[PDB]
Structures are given as C-alpha cells and as structure tokens.
Amino acid sequence: VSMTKTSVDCTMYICGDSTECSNLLLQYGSFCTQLNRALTGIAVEQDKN
Amino acid sequence: LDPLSETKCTLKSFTVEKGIYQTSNFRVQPTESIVRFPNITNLCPFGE
Ligand SMILES: *[C@@H]1O[C@H](CO[C@@H]2O[C@@H](C)[C@@H](O)[C@@H](O)[C@@H]2O)[C@@H](O[C@@H]2O[C@H](CO)[C@@H](O)[C@H](O)[C@H]2NC(C)=O)[C@H](O)[C@H]1NC(C)=O
C-alpha cells in the first residue's frame, strides 16, 4: 500500500559541511531543489495511498 | 528574517498558500578549533 518516506539533503550528501563544495554545487542551478521536490511528491503520495 | 520569509524565498513567491513546507536543514556549527599533533621538538635535518 505504501513504502518508506525518505528525504535527502542534497547539500549534506554531496558536500557534507564543506563551504567550497557548496559554492561549486550552486553552479548546477535547481537540481538539488528538483530532487527534494521529487522526493516530497513521493512522500506526500504514501499518505494519499 | 524569520521562518515565513525563508518559505517565501524557497517557494519564490511573495504569497504562501496553506501548508507545511520543507526548508534549509538546521545544523549546529563549531564552538572552537582543535589541533592534535604528536609532540615533537627537534627540526628535520634538511640542511644535511
Ligand atoms: C643551506 O645554507 C643556506 C646558507 O648557507 C649557510 O649559511 C649560514 C647559516 C652558514 O651555515 C654558512 O656557512 C652557509 O653558507 C641556508 O640559508 C639560510 O636559511 C635561513 C633560514 O633557515 C635564513 O635565515 C638565512 O638568511 C639563509 N642564509 C643564506 C645565506 O641562505 C639554508 O637554510 C641551508 N639549508 C639547510 C637545509 O640547512
């Protein structure tokens, strides 16, 4: 009927506590926000189901 | 400024509809620095 809801901090997975890596990751634009928008859509749906 | 301003800024809208919104993860930052090196007094013999 449902599966495990997950959320993934794209900054902490890619760059965990580094600031240099954050300033480089910003050059890809919306990809981290788009990943969290996708996993939030999956997570809201587990309650709809 | 405040948690609502961070939602307006994350939704890219000056108005926010009713809901619960995920925002920037919090994280406690360093209180101080540490260094721990083995205590050695003698310099390396690079002249030799
Ligand atoms: C290699 O030697 C240079 C200098 O040659 C010696 O200088 C005197 C100290 C004395 O030993 C002379 O008989 C030699 O000719 C060293 O360069 C010095 O480095 C220090 C910092 O460590 C600096 O304060 C000095 O101004 C430098 N002086 C000169 C002339 O270079 C160098 O340190 C030596 N390298 C090693 C690995 O010992």
Question: Cα Rg for chain B, rounded, in angstroms?
Answer: 25
User: Using CA atoms, how far apart are residues A7 and A40, in angstroms rounded to an integer?
Assistant: 7
Query: Is there an atom of ligand 1 within 6 Å of B45 CB?
Result: no
Per the CB < 8 A criterion, the answer to whether A6 and A35 are in contact is: no
**Residues B12-36: b if buried by 16+ CB within 10 A, e if exposed:** eeeeeeeeeeeeeeeeeeeeeeeee
User: Using CA atoms, how far apart are residues A41 and B6, in angstroms rounded to an integer?
Assistant: 20
Separation of CA A12 and ligand 1 centre (Å): 48
SS3 (DSSP) at B8: helix
At what resolution in Å was this solved?
3.1
- Chain A CB contacts of B25 under 8 Å are 9, 11-12
User: Using CA atoms, how far apart are residues A24 and A28, in angstroms rounded to an integer?
Assistant: 8
The three state secondary structure string of B28-47 is CCCCCCCCCCCCCCCCCCCC
| Closest Cα in chain A to B27 | A17
Per the CB < 8 A criterion, the answer to whether A4 and A49 are in contact is: no
CB–CB contact A12 B22 (8 Å): no
Experimentally, how was this structure solved?
cryo-EM
DSSP string, A2-41: --------HHHHHHTT-HHHHHHHGGGTTHHHHHHHHHHH
